[PDB]
Point group: C3
Chain length 455, copies 3
């Protein structure tokens, strides 16, 4: 029989609904198709990104280690499941000993000999009180936990590839913007040099143009480096080189992601892989309490073989030399100086530790999803404000330029307007990147992209 | 007897006093009430923060795992302490075997049978040279180490909750400042629109006001997000929701912390929990050398039972069927092909590793405390300078505004002054946050807040 | 015999050459003296840095733990290598038991006794199918892996000490620059106060000078703190205090590093320590497959002693009381309910996991080296651009100042020029630091500085 305690899922120590406030929209509530069911093929619209995610799914080495781990823990479960059954082997044994007279059978010193070849089992533990089965069930729960760990690793890898691709694309946009602004500054500096060679443009205007040109050159080199390093990061995350015939990707100003629902927090318990990993770890910890308990009950062992035995090696397998052995044992502990009780306390404390860690997994998932929702409820406003700021700075630069052709202004206000426009556009690229990254992380936290197509 | 080497605490490989220089004040020297004795109820003046720290102390799941760990290592010590005593059980044994004629007692093939029920101990190791006791003492030292680990986890959690609360408060202040500055910019933009509709204000002034308004709007959205995310972070660190009836908190411009003393570096050895954890780990490593050594001396074992035995099952417990067994053993190793010596080398290298790790713990604590002191000796000057900068920028903005009502200046100098004032105030909030965080981390490094009230 | 599979190094899952693009120079190809052979005494020209690296090599505690680890894994290999040979000990045994009549030799209840002192081995496993040798070879491969781990730790420590020294030096330069700019601002503010007391300088100019002075004061305090904290970081990385009589160091504007070659990616396989660590881990995983396999073949055991035995304690060691025992065993498993097969699957999956982790080590090294090359191919351009920007801002400030002595400009353009110059110089210091750090990390990734002199 089995001494495992009944397993009861701990209550989620999180609020019943995601936090509401100035940064949060209205709670959508229960979703018909939850985020974890929305495949990454549908969440990510960019087909090049989809083919890259597929390349990573099939070539990233960390995900490969995760899948191998599932296989190893399945082996371990299988090793524990086998230990229930008697191990049956062939045993060849010989014994040849000299013995002094007071211990020999003859009364004088003697050389005795004995030989046997038997088929049987030694010290087989008859799982009467479920110790071995408890250990099997803990192995099984740790294996299910490893499976959930693989699914979590995949969601992590998907989000990592998306973020690497988006970061490379954003830095490529920054590089292009810097190229355009450097070309503008270089044209302006050459015109100002020609106007200074004729005594019209002052040295002040020329030096300010030169500062603008050098600053743009330095930022150009910086973003050139960042673009190459983002390529390297993406190649590492893919586990393979970038394919040559990739489909056409979408630019940052397109709709790149599907707006995934928030759902209820409780959905996480059933749909977020690392929470299910935590829960299977807890169910294993619980399973091991059965073993700790079974130790106090009687242990039943059996040693049994059948085969041939003889005093002479020449008499083996020979008619009239058959032998067999049946040897049962029971052991009931009485006194261990508190050992068995301390072992059971250990088992119980382990269950408690796993309870705390499952609860902490739930709280961490809640915090990550609430942070994603606070980012969803504010990046739209911040991006509208940043688009309006880019527009207003462009209007101001165009007005200063239309005033410049009629003189009036000096060659400082125009450079200031251009610098502010460049900074505003860099910040707009960065903000778009941050909004896309927050949305990807929210998809991951809700249940991620374990599915390729939507279930 | 016991072969554990004498334990001698390694010398602290740090300077005798904290580093002195331009960033450090004068060394206060030995403190009457050291930082580790100052309770977190006294260190933190904000009563809302105190109630939040209490909520975290009773609901954070990592601290719960730490406390459970102390209990598990205590179980393990108890399991090792029991192994000294003989395990006494009841043993039921049966043996029924067929044997060929040349091996049977009758000279022809025979079925013999034997049964016994005894009370006794099997293979009990008489701890003569202290092997088992060495292992017990290593278990005990690892348990004391786990206790110190819990205390370190609590200090870490206290500092983390303080820093989360201060970060939420600072970002709320940034949000309020941004609201005020956005309202000012919006009033100014509406007045400039009305002045432009009558041909008085130029399009340049209007576009610059619009850029200011959009920038403030974007920063407003950003800080709105940060405030919500800081709330989420704090809720995760509490392990529970924020309580509704919290006392009134103190604002950032108040005195939030007590200035804790620096003390001597040596104080750390006796008062910083992770150093004591390291030292108990080392004392355990040392304890295990006793076991490694005891292996070379004789091992003494005893098997002893008393009970009933009989050739027939029907003859058990029956008068004249009593039996008893006394079976001692000594084993002295002679040749192991260097095994035992390599085992002892392993034990000794482990002691050495723990020595290095205790020393590294001391050096790390010294570096953290010296960094806290370098922050204490400079944040005051930086905060004075930043207050003076905010004041000077406010004077400049007020003078530009008092000049604006009489025309003279354009609608660009005023916006520049307002932008500089806003940036200076943001930096002042950030600097106050950094000073408070550095002070909290210094309290943690010195010995933290294991005590609630001052001892 | 041995059932270990043949070991075949996995193909490098990286491109045949480092990535080429706008941020990368032309591939130098195979180097005559590869980076891993260039000693850190030659790579780092600053002799003070060399003496500091030596101090860290001999006093850093993490590197000490790494070296101790090599010694511990060597002990473990030695413990496994010994297990091949029979453990020979002296065995003292006694047995005194009462037995009921139906089981005694006399037919009535009897007390029998037996004593022996023998020299021999018990249950010695004759490594016929290489199980023990397989475990030895896995121990040996894990030891070689630990050796490579030490070398990687040293390269890491060297790069960490270089980066700590360069960061301290850069922040000291920032502190000196801030001191100079604060002195300039203070002189200018005092002159403006004297010019305002006579009604010449406006309050606007005075307030703007005061803002500049306070900003410089705050930045001064910040960099003062950073310098002290960098000192603390360096002291922690050294494991010892800074020596007093250090040689003269080189300034940031000097040539501090030797430009190390890139070489081929394949060079990493043979020259980067953590890849060789990964490979030895894989060779160990492979080695353990031999043990998993050997389990299925017959196990051969021997128990053999020679000594004295007697029915009376007084008859030991006595002429005619010699005895000896020769007891061989063979065990061939037949049925284990899939256990042995699951054990072999486990071994094989472990080999596969180590394959994936070695491949991932190769890909990570490639990405780190490609990032170092993308930094090498762009920091030169960015630093030229930043020097030109500092020069142009200095020209602009000098022209504005030469115009100021003849009045014309107000006391705002000069402060703006000074602020831009200060920011440009800070960014130039930061860029030089980043270029030096990237070059150090590239040296580490290529093979680091395991050698002191060049091999
Ligand atoms: C003589 C051998 C009998 C050994 C007892 C076997 C105990 C069987 O145990 C059963 O095995 C199944 C899979 O193995 C599982 O489905 C059951 O849950 C499990 O209880
Ligand atoms: C025919 C042998 C019966 C074995 C005793 C009970 C073992 C229970 O074990 C079950 O035995 C089944 C076959 O009997 C197998 O198909 C199952 O895999 C196994 O779980
Ligand atoms: C007649 C009494 C028979 C005793 C046989 C079983 C004794 C079990 O002992 C009990 O086992 C429990 C585990 O489930 C533990 O919780 C208890 O602490 C332990 O006392
Ligand atoms: C591993 C199984 C070992 C037990 C196999 C023995 C099967 C039954 O044992 C039989 O019992 C009879 C009388 O009791 C004898 O006459 C037979 O010789 C004997 O084989
Ligand atoms: C020449 C090398 C071969 C060595 C033979 C080893 C086998 C030893 O032979 C032994 O000798 C005994 C006599 O004392 C015989 O009675 C035994 O039957 C036999 O086991
Ligand atoms: C595997 C061990 C099985 C060996 C079979 C032993 O031998 C068998 O048992 C008796 C002894 O010879 C004989 O009576 C049988 O005829 C013989 O086949
Ligand atoms: C290494 C394992 C091989 C198995 C041994 C073959 C089985 C031996 O076979 C036996 O040999 C005896 C002669 O000694 C004969 O008396 C038996 O009839 C015969 O069955
Ligand atoms: C046959 C089993 C014997 C059980 C022996 C003692 C069981 C618990 O031990 C108790 O703990 C006390 C601690 O002071 C000891 O003094 C006593 O042995 C006993 O009262
Ligand atoms: C066979 C009896 C030998 C002497 C009995 C020693 C019993 C030791 O006493 C043990 O002390 C522990 C606390 O220290 C308790 O937890 C154990 O229950 C108790 O049995
Ligand atoms: C017959 C059982 C005797 C076993 C030897 C017991 C060894 C006792 O050992 C003692 O036990 C105490 C707590 O357990 C400790 O206070 C002592 O430091 C320890 O030496
Ligand atoms: C009464 C049994 C004596 C046991 C032999 C020495 C065991 C020493 O052990 C001690 O025994 C004490 C009771 O004697 C217990 O109170 C202690 O917990 C225990 O440490
Ligand atoms: C007459 C000689 C008696 C030998 C019995 C003990 C032999 C101990 O042997 C010694 O034990 C020490 C551990 O303390 C080790 O340091 C030594 O290397 C080992 O040789
Ligand atoms: C676990 C303890 C087992 C030993 C208990 C036996 C107690 C003493 O043993 C006694 O010795 C006497 C002569 O030597 C005999 O007359 C007694 O029958 C016998 O019980
Ligand atoms: C009908 C199902 C019950 C099976 C009974 C199993 C007990 C076997 O009974 C055995 O048989 C022997 C004869 O060879 C007896 O002499 C033994 O006393 C007995 O152990
Ligand atoms: C627990 C095992 C204890 C069983 C007690 C065995 O039986 C006891 O010993 C002898 C054999 O019967 C008799 O002389 C005693 O009267 C009897 O009580
Ligand atoms: C399962 C454990 C139960 C313990 C068995 C009860 C003890 C048996 O009791 C014994 O039974 C004998 C008859 O066979 C009698 O001769 C003995 O007098 C009686 O004490
Ligand atoms: C009874 C114990 C026997 C001890 C056997 C050898 C002890 C150490 O072994 C030594 O190492 C040498 C290595 O070349 C071997 O040649 C020799 O066996 C021996 O000199
Ligand atoms: C019983 C003797 C069997 C042959 C003796 C083999 C002894 C192996 O020699 C061993 O080699 C090691 C170095 O390799 C040494 O560290 C060991 O001390 C030495 O004993
Ligand atoms: C009687 C003792 C014999 C035990 C078998 C020893 C197996 C020897 O094994 C050999 O030992 C050497 C170092 O130990 C290695 O160089 C060899 O690779 C290894 O195969
Ligand atoms: C002289 C004892 C021979 C031991 C049997 C083969 C053991 C092989 O082992 C080798 O033995 C050599 C000495 O013989 C040692 O020098 C080597 O260290 C050892 O690897
Ligand atoms: C006459 C048949 C002799 C069987 C003795 C060895 C049986 C080995 O068995 C085989 O060992 C291999 C390991 O190398 C495994 O891959 C196989 O799965 C296993 O079946
Ligand atoms: C650990 C080694 C134990 C075996 C040592 C015994 C050496 C050889 O054994 C010899 O065999 C002869 C006949 O076979 C007898 O006359 C001798 O008395 C006996 O010593
Ligand atoms: C006075 C304290 C010393 C106790 C002596 C313990 C040794 C017990 O002495 C035993 O008694 C037997 C008689 O039954 C003798 O025949 C045995 O030779 C002897 O082992
Ligand atoms: C270590 C155990 C070795 C003890 C030696 C046993 O004693 C030896 O063997 C026989 C019995 O006395 C005698 O014939 C020998 O002369 C004697 O030296
Ligand atoms: C504790 C180990 C000490 C070893 C015991 C010394 C060896 C004993 O020596 C033996 O003593 C016998 C008397 O009993 C004599 O007959 C033997 O001649 C003598 O060799
Ligand atoms: C002497 C070794 C006995 C081998 C026993 C069975 C070996 C594999 O077991 C098989 O698996 C099936 C699962 O349904 C079981 O029904 C059967 O026992 C068997 O066909
Ligand atoms: C001695 C035979 C007792 C009954 C045989 C039970 C065999 C259990 O069957 C086992 O089931 C596993 C799948 O579940 C397979 O992987 C094993 O190969 C198979 O042997
Ligand atoms: C689940 O609750 C378990 C039920 C109780 C079973 C008790 C144990 C009986 C089996 C013992 C048979 C072993 C024979 C040994 C002969 C000396
Ligand atoms: C501490 O220094 C230990 C002191 C030395 C004690 C030596 C061992 C004596 C005990 C042996 C008794 C076992 C009897 C076995 C009978 C064959
Ligand atoms: C490598 O391929 C192994 C070769 C095959 C050797 C087979 C095993 C023979 C040794 C057995 C000797 C033990 C004697 C036991 C007596 C009953």
């Amino acid at each position: 029989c089995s001494l495992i305690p009944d397993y009861q899922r701990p209550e989620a120590p999180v609020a019943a609904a995601y936090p509401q406030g100035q940064a949060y929209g209205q709670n959508t509530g229960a979703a018909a198709v939850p985020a974890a069911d929305i495949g990454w093929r549908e969440f990510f619209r960019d087909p090049q990104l989809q083919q890259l995610i597929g390349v990573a799914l099939e070539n990233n080495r960390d995900l490969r280690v995760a899948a191998l781990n599932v296989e190893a823990f399945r082996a371990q479960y299988r090793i524990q499941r086998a230990d229930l059954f008697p191990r049956i082997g062939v045993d060849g044994s010989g014994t040849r000993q000299r013995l002094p007279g007071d211990l020999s059978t003859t009364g004088s010193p003697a050389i005795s000999s004995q030989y046997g070849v038997t088929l049987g089992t030694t010290a087989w533990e008859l799982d009467l009180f479920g110790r071995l089965r408890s250990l099997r069930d803990q192995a099984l729960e740790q294996y299910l936990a490893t499976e959930q760990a693989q699914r979590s690793a995949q969601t992590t890898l998907v989000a990592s590839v998306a973020t690497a691709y988006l970061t490379l694309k954003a830095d490529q946009a920054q590089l292009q913007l810097t190229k355009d602004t450097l070309g503008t500054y270089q044209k302006s500096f050459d015109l100002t040099q020609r106007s200074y060679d004729v005594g019209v443009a002052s040295a002040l205007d020329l030096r300010q143009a030169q500062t603008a040109v050098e600053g743009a050159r330095a930022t150009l080199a910086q973003y050139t480096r960042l673009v190459a390093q983002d390529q390297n990061a993406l190649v590492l995350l893919l586990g393979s080189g970038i394919p040559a015939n990739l489909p056409q990707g979408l630019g940052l100003d397109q709709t790149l992601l599907t707006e995934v629902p928030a759902g209820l927090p409780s959905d996480l318990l059933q749909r977020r892989p690392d929470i299910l990993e935590a829960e299977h770890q807890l169910m294993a910890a619980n399973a091991s309490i059965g073993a700790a308990r079974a130790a106090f009950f009687p242990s039943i062992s059996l040693t049994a073989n059948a085969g041939t035995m003889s005093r002479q090696l020449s008499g083996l397998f020979d008619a009239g030399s058959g032998s067999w052995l049946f040897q049962p044992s029971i052991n009931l502990p009485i006194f261990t100086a508190g050992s068995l009780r301390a072992s059971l306390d250990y088992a119980k404390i382990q269950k408690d530790i796993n309870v705390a860690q499952y609860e902490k997994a739930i709280q961490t998932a809640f915090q990550e999803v609430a942070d994603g929702l606070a980012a969803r409820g504010t990046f739209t406003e911040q991006l509208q404000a940043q688009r309006d700021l880019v527009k207003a700075s462009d209007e101001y630069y165009q007005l200063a330029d239309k005033l410049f052709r009629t003189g009036v202004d000096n060659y400082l206000t125009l450079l200031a307007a251009q610098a502010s426009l460049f900074t505003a556009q860099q910040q707009l690229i960065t903000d778009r990147l941050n909004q896309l990254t927050s949305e990807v992380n929210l998809y991951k936290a809700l249940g991620g992209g374990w599915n390729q197509q939507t279930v």
